[PDB]
Amino acid sequence: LPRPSGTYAGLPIADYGDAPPLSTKTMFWRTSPEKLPPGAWEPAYLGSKDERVDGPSLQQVMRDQLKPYSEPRGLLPPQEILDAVCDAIENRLENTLEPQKPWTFKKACESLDKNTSSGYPYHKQKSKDWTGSAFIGDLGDQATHANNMYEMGKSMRPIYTAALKDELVKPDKIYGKIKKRLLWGSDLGTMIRAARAFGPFCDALKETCIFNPIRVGMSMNEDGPFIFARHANFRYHMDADYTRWDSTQQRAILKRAGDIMVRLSPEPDLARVVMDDLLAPSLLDVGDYKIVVEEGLPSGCPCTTQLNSLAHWILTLCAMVEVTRVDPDIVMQESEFSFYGDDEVVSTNLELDMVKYTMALRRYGLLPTRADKEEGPLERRQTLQGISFLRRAIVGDQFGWYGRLDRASIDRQLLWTKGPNHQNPFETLPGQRPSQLMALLGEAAMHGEKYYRTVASRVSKEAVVPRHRSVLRWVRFG
Numbered sequence: 001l002p003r004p005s006g007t008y009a010g011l012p013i014a015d016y017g018d019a020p021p022l023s024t025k026t027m028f029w030r031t032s033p034e035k036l037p038p039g040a041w042e043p044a045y046l047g048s049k050d051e052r053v054d055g056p057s058l059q060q061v062m063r064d065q066l067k068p069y070s071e072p073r074g075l076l077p078p079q080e081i082l083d084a085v086c087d088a089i090e091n092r093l094e095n096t097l098e099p100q101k102p103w104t105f106k107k108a109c110e111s112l113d114k115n116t117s118s119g120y121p122y123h124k125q126k127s128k129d130w131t132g133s134a135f136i137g138d139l140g141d142q143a144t145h146a147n148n149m150y151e152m153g154k155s156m157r158p159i160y161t162a163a164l165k166d167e168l169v170k171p172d173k174i175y176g177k178i179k180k181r182l183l184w185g186s187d188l189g190t191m192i193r194a195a196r197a198f199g200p201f202c203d204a205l206k207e208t209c210i211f212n213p214i215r216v217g218m219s220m221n222e223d224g225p226f227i228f229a230r231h232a233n234f235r236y237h238m239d240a241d242y243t244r245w246d247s248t249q250q251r252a253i254l255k256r257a258g259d260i261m262v263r264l265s266p267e268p269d270l271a272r273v274v275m276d277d278l279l280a281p282s283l284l285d286v287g288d289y290k291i292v293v294e295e296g297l298p299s300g301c302p303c304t305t306q307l308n309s310l311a312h313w314i315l316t317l318c319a320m321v322e323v324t325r326v327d328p329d330i331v332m333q334e335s336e337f338s339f340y341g342d343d344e345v346v347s348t349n350l351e352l353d354m355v356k357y358t359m360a361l362r363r364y365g366l367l368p369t370r371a372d373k374e375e376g377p378l379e380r381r382q383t384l385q386g387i388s389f390l391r392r393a394i395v396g397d398q399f400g401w402y403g404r405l406d407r408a409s410i411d412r413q414l415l416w417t418k419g420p421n422h423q424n425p426f427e428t429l430p431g432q433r434p435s436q437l438m439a440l441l442g443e444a445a446m447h448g449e450k451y452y453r454t455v456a457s458r459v460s461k462e463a464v465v466p467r468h469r470s471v472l473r474w475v476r477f478g
Helices: 058-069 080-094 105-111 137-151 188-207 220-231 251-263 268-279 304-326 328-333 354-365 407-415 434-445 449-460 468-476
Strands: 011-016 026-030 160-166 182-185 236-238 283-286 290-295 335-340 341-348 392-397 398-403 416-422
Touching: 011 058, 026 354, 058 290, 080 220, 080 251, 080 290, 080 304, 080 328, 105 137, 105 188, 137 188, 160 236, 160 328, 182 434, 188 268, 188 304, 220 335, 220 392, 220 398, 251 407, 283 416, 304 328, 304 335, 304 354, 328 335, 407 416, 407 434, 407 449, 434 449, 449 468
Parallel strands: 160 283
Antiparallel strands: 011 290, 026 416, 160 182, 236 341, 283 290, 335 341, 392 398
């Protein structure tokens, strides 16, 4: 009956938790029983029952991920720079975004991924209470109540459920120092409220994803060429390649980003209530306890990605303004940015003082990294070729610019397929992957005949195998 107290990974305990145990299974299966090449990526660590190594508990792995959230924040950019940057960003969006209709409860509900958990308190696959058009049963009650609170402009405390990400990782993350990525799973109620509040702004942004630097919702194949052509119109190109972006975020910056989102939403008074709840100290369910996380990015909700990209835009433009002493408006005139959460490409005509720029980013608490992992300033280059975005290398030829998945990544996707959760990643799946096989064919085609022929060979062995010229033409030009 009395609330528990204490510390968990440096963070205060606020209540007992209701989260179900961390998964010990992976969705990844080998496509073949052959042994893996040396240094091959494998699914992330599965805990005490992982037959591959003896490691810590998944709870300890999770505690390791939370430690940076209790670290001190970096500094805010200088107030007059911050205000001018935020004003300039808001003004650009005002000038580009089409005003939207408010989102209905029905649109909010439909927009939700039904294949994921509803989080607190029911922790059930959303599809379990979905009829095709509405939530019913327990989730209907949660969704309706949250909708009523939204319409009343009434606050609700979001409750997040911590998980660890099942994904392919480099082998040193399994056989050396074990790491697995922290995920925040939002409660269905919060998802409904954020979807209603911020769905319109996110739609507006997605429709301008070539004109505006927030690239969320872009299609690599269809929008990439125009996006990268715009970047190519500028002299210098870079990628700061951040470590632990989400956990280094400052809530004071996120609130400035949130202010812009609220102000450009069709229901700003209702949106303000939702944003304030999103950014208030975050209750995170870690199994036995719910803890309070005051800082960093609470990444439960889909609109998270846009908020995070907007923070990124704020921080990048602050550093550039600080260093060049040029107005944010002028910097924008002389630059093309691409942001997707922590992922960026910055192109500019400005001769940036890279030492000072790197210093400024680190000042803000960020952890940019050089390609070579050395301790100096970030590098700038005069060619866009060699820079990545959304895990695709940017490539230019006589036909234009495009994003190409590298050979290691294509090779990796041939080694693994997704299926039901299981304990041993090295099991092959007894026995269909037509659309994914076609995509890999496309991607391989972009690496020329020699590499394509090998990929098509391994792809025939699994399974209609078109000629190189034909698939190349298809994947590049619609």
